[PDB]
Amino acid sequence: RFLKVKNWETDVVLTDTLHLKSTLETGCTEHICMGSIMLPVRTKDQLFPLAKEFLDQYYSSIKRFGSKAHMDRLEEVNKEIESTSTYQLKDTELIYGAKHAWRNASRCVGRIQWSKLQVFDARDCTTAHGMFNYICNHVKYATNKGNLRSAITIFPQRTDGKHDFRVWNSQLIRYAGYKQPDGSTLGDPANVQFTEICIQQGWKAPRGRFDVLPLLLQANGNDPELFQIPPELVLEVPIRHPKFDWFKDLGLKWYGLPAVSNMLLEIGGLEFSACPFSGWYMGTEIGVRDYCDNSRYNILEEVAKKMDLDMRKTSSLWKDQALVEINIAVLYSFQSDKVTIVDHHSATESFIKHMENEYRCRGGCPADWVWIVPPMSGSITPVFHQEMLNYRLTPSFEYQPDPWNTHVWKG
Amino acid sequence: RFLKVKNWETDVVLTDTLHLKSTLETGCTEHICMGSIMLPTKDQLFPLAKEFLDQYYSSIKRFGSKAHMDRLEEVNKEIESTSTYQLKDTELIYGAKHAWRNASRCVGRIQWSKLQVFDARDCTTAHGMFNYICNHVKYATNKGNLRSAITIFPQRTDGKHDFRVWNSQLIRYAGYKQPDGSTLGDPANVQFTEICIQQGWKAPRGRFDVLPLLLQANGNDPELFQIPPELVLEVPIRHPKFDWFKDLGLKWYGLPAVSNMLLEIGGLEFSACPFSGWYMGTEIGVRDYCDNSRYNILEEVAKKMDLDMRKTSSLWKDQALVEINIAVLYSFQSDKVTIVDHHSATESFIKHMENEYRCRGGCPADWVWIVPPMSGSITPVFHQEMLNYRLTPSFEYQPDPWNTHVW
Ligand code: HEM
Ligand code: HEM
Ligand SMILES: C[C@H](O)[C@H](O)[C@H]1CNc2nc(N)[nH]c(=O)c2N1
Ligand SMILES: C[C@H](O)[C@H](O)[C@H]1CNc2nc(N)[nH]c(=O)c2N1
Numbered sequence: 001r002f003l004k005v006k007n008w009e010t011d012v013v014l015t016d017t018l019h020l021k022s023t024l025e026t027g028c029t030e031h032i033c034m035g036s037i038m039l040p041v042r043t044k045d046q047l048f049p050l051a052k053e054f055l056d057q058y059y060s061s062i063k064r065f066g067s068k069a070h071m072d073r074l075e076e077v078n079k080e081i082e083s084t085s086t087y088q089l090k091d092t093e094l095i096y097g098a099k100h101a102w103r104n105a106s107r108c109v110g111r112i113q114w115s116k117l118q119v120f121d122a123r124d125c126t127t128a129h130g131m132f133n134y135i136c137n138h139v140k141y142a143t144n145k146g147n148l149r150s151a152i153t154i155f156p157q158r159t160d161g162k163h164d165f166r167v168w169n170s171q172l173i174r175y176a177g178y179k180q181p182d183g184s185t186l187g188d189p190a191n192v193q194f195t196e197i198c199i200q201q202g203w204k205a206p207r208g209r210f211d212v213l214p215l216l217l218q219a220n221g222n223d224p225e226l227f228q229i230p231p232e233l234v235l236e237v238p239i240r241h242p243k244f245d246w247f248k249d250l251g252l253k254w255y256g257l258p259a260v261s262n263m264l265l266e267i268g269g270l271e272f273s274a275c276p277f278s279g280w281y282m283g284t285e286i287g288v289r290d291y292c293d294n295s296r297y298n299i300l301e302e303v304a305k306k307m308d309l310d311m312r313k314t315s316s317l318w319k320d321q322a323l324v325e326i327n328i329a330v331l332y333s334f335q336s337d338k339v340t341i342v343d344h345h346s347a348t349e350s351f352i353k354h355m356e357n358e359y360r361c362r363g364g365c366p367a368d369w370v371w372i373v374p375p376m377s378g379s380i381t382p383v384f385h386q387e388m389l390n391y392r393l394t395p396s397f398e399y400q401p402d403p404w405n406t407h408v409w410k411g
Numbered sequence: 412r413f414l415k416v417k418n419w420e421t422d423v424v425l426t427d428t429l430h431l432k433s434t435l436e437t438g439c440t441e442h443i444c445m446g447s448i449m450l451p452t453k454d455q456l457f458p459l460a461k462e463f464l465d466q467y468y469s470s471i472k473r474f475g476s477k478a479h480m481d482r483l484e485e486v487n488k489e490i491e492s493t494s495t496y497q498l499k500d501t502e503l504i505y506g507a508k509h510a511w512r513n514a515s516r517c518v519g520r521i522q523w524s525k526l527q528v529f530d531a532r533d534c535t536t537a538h539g540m541f542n543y544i545c546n547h548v549k550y551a552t553n554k555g556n557l558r559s560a561i562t563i564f565p566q567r568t569d570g571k572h573d574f575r576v577w578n579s580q581l582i583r584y585a586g587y588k589q590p591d592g593s594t595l596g597d598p599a600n601v602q603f604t605e606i607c608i609q610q611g612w613k614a615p616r617g618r619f620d621v622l623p624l625l626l627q628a629n630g631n632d633p634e635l636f637q638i639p640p641e642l643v644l645e646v647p648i649r650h651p652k653f654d655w656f657k658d659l660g661l662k663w664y665g666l667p668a669v670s671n672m673l674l675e676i677g678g679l680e681f682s683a684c685p686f687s688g689w690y691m692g693t694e695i696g697v698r699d700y701c702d703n704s705r706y707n708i709l710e711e712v713a714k715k716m717d718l719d720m721r722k723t724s725s726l727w728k729d730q731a732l733v734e735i736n737i738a739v740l741y742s743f744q745s746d747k748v749t750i751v752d753h754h755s756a757t758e759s760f761i762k763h764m765e766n767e768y769r770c771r772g773g774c775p776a777d778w779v780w781i782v783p784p785m786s787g788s789i790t791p792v793f794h795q796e797m798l799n800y801r802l803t804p805s806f807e808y809q810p811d812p813w814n815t816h817v818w
């Protein structure tokens with residue numbers, strides 16, 4: 001069976017066959033679409049089919065499907081599974097795995113870059129201190145003095161689910177959030193729960209509006225441990241505006257390296273619960289969501305005041321006006337400091353080209369429209385007009401519960 | 412499977428039970444989501460009628476009444492002999508209001524129960540159709556104080572006697588293909604504008620020529636009619652800050668009146684059912700004015716603003732987009748024509764969702780369509796999980812007549 005997607009700006013029609021290789025489920029049924037829903041101990045039994053499918057893929061890509069090297073590998077993995085109930089990926093298979101998980105990430109607009117990914121194999125790691133060292137190197141390498149390079153660091157896979165490696169942080173670099181007695185929040189409201197955990201685990205908080213959180217690292221199912229990232233490794237950008245000199249006085253900055261650290265990487269049925277990965281920011285992530293979401297820094301009011309907009313009626317579009325200036329300032333600041341960033345126009349355009357390329361060479365490209373369309377100026381970006389099909393391929397990055405909700409405390 | 416939806420800005424959680432009365436299909440499966448795809452007999456007829464009558468009598472609190480059973484029996488007999496049936500006026504009004512209520516892509520449904528229904532089922536000719544449509548337009552426009560309305564023409568019979576309005580909206584601007592390959596006026600309406608000319612229309616060939624009506628009665632060849640200009644309310648677009656903005660020569664019409672859809676009630680199909688409410692500002696300022704395949708005015712406006720159009724990262728497109736949308740809202744408000752900005756409309760829709768969950772057990776909603784085409788995440792609907800499903804009575808898409816009509 002074949003499926004068509006149309007772009008309603010250009011009338012380009014594309015044919016998807018890739019969706020046929022999808023097995024995982026979307027959350028949708030024929031009677032209900034759950035397209036906007038945020039989020040809708042494995043045994044020998046199910047493991048070998050998962051392994052075989054991955055190896056078939058891997059060997060196909062390297063033009064060796066059905067080869068002796070292919071068949072011996074299947075043999076070796078099967079034997080290893082039945083005798084140990086799991087198996088180890090070769091380095092080559094791991095790199096292929098991590099790249100393809102990115103390539104398959106239907107909510108990622110930056111996938112044109114998927115084949116350029118620095119993979120750091122941290123499977124020999126055994127302790128939280130070992131984790132800290134690996135993570136420090138990741139940050140230094142990925143940051144590259146502002147000329148960012150995509151990377152992922154992969155810690156040992158899950159075994160019995162009792163010895164998980166986890167990074168308790170949602171990102172390697174993120175700002176603290178502190179609930180005040182008066183109900184207001186100082187710093188980043190999205191990180192209040194985690195900040196409280198850190199403080200309980202012994203962190204001495206500076207209690208400012210932009211305090212870089214410590215790392216909270218769990219090796220081998222043990223209680224997690226605190227570590228401070230060397231400040232010289234944490235690249236930050238002060239936010240100013242090219243025309244508005246008062247903008248610097250708002251006191252805003254952000255970090256340059258977004259590094260998602262709470263997701264689970266699945267490859268050939270293996271689960272990598274600690275796999276921090278980093279690329280670089282699209283401007284609107286910071287300028288629109290982080291700064292202007294009502295539940296985040298929420299600076300719209302303060303910015304609008306200083307611009308002296310008519311704030312008494314929403315139909316003045318004072319919010320829309322402030323938002324643009326804020327996003328101009330983010331992009332300006334990063335570019336002036338030579339820190340890699342991409343605007344939403346450039347990024348979405350690149351994605352369209354990527355997506356078209358993928359249809360031709362791969363037979364499709366799973367894409368989550370709800371997430372791909374930028375959170376400002378949607379319809380003036382080409383992705384708005386692009387029909388997309390969303391489905392799940394493996395390897396993949398998956399959500400997992402925050403570890404403090406599952407972790408068995410040792411003491 | 413009594414599903415929950417969460418708002419991630421407010422942490423409000425609603426439980427949906429209404430979805431378990433979904434009649435039709437979404438196009439999605441367990442294996443693929445198609446949420447961003449734009450367009451995914453007597454035996455058939457009686458269960459459809461029964462289902463509708465069941466809702467109807469439940470809503471007036473006479474479920475399982477003599478009146479209810481009588482009406483079921485009565486309709487049942489009518490189908491057996493006539494192969495169809497006719498709705499009582501009350502059922503027609505309920506059906507239309509509920510089609511709107513059920514339109515998962517409509518952000519303005521908080522108004523759903525205040526719909527003026529015009530029964531045009533006695534209409535027999537295109538001239539009669541014209542008359543009904545002029546009355547609709549005058550009533551709905553209401554000197555700028557717009558009132559939602561629908562006019563319903565006779566239902567399909569054998570599919571060979573359909574009533575259709577060939578226009579996509581009662582009021583829209585023409586589209587002409589120029590010698591230099593470009594397009595004058597509205598590119599979305601080029602094909603339709605051709606067909607009008609192909610039929611006899613004398614096009615003044617301007618940037619904003621109101622199209623003639625092309626009306627089809629009882630399956631006949633459609634006929635042209637010109638809406639009395641005095642009935643077409645238009646707004647000159649100016650900016651409250653930029654004097655040069657009025658020089659751009661932009662205008663739009665006050666009355667959006669969708670005319671190419673099909674209203675389905677109790678299995679009965681109304682192929683001609685033009686309906687009208689009023690505009691959200693972004694429909695005009697963002698989509699109609701700034702889509703690349705529409706009026707596409709961004710570059711011209713940014714130019715007049717003297718923005719740095721060298722790099723995309725100056726966000727000149729975004730800056731211009733805002734000002735354009737400020738002007739649209741400003742102009743309509745200044746001329747006392749009803750319009751709603753995207754902040755007010757989305758906030759009202761959140762309140763409506765609240766109401767529907769509380770009083771009805773849910774509200775089908777299509778996030779992809781509900782979230783406005785600018786400033787998405789600063790509107791509350793962006794952070795609102797929505798469940799999409801098809802309830803009936805409903806408005807459905809139907810083919811353009813010209814692809815189907817025998818002459
Ligand atoms: C290199 C530049 C990149 C850009 C500009 C980019 C852009 C984005 C954006 C804007 C999102 C939505 C995030 C949000 O709204 O919170 C996203 C999501 C995502 N990205 Fe990328 N990305 C990049 C690199 C990467 C890399 C290197 C990986 C993995 C190796 C990756 C995997 C993902 C995944 C799995 C998601 C889904 C996140 C979620 O569901 O919360 N991306 N990306
Ligand atoms: C009164 C104020 C109203 C507002 C502010 C409003 C707003 C909107 C908007 C913004 C859309 C998206 C359409 C687009 O972007 O092209 C829409 C779609 C829709 N509306 Fe409403 N509307 C209103 C009245 C009505 C009425 C009176 C009806 C029917 C009686 C209706 C039924 C629909 C339907 C069926 C759609 C989907 C159209 C499609 O799928 O192309 N609306 N509405
Ligand atoms: C409810 C809705 O799905 C949710 O707000 C989504 C919408 N789209 C998004 N898109 C991106 N890129 N990031 C997000 O966090 C979200 N949030
Ligand atoms: C491809 C995509 O589904 C298409 O561009 C949709 C997106 N969302 C929309 N939303 C509204 N309100 N109106 C539209 O025409 C569209 N178009």
Ligand SMILES: C[S@@](=O)CC(=N)NCCC[C@H](N)C(=O)O
Pocket residue numbers: 110171258259260277278279280281282285286289290
């Ligand atoms: C891994 S990262 O380079 C992918 C990315 N560009 N962003 C993902 C999360 C960043 C998050 N939205 C933020 O604003 O911090």
Ligand SMILES: C[S@@](=O)CC(=N)NCCC[C@H](N)C(=O)O
Pocket residue numbers: 667668669686687688689690691694695698699
């Ligand atoms: C029937 S109308 O009141 C519903 C509405 N507000 N708009 C839908 C169609 C209008 C279309 N988007 C336009 O910009 O002309």
Ligand SMILES: [Zn+2]
Pocket residue numbers: 028032033034035439440443444445446
């Ligand atoms: Zn779906």
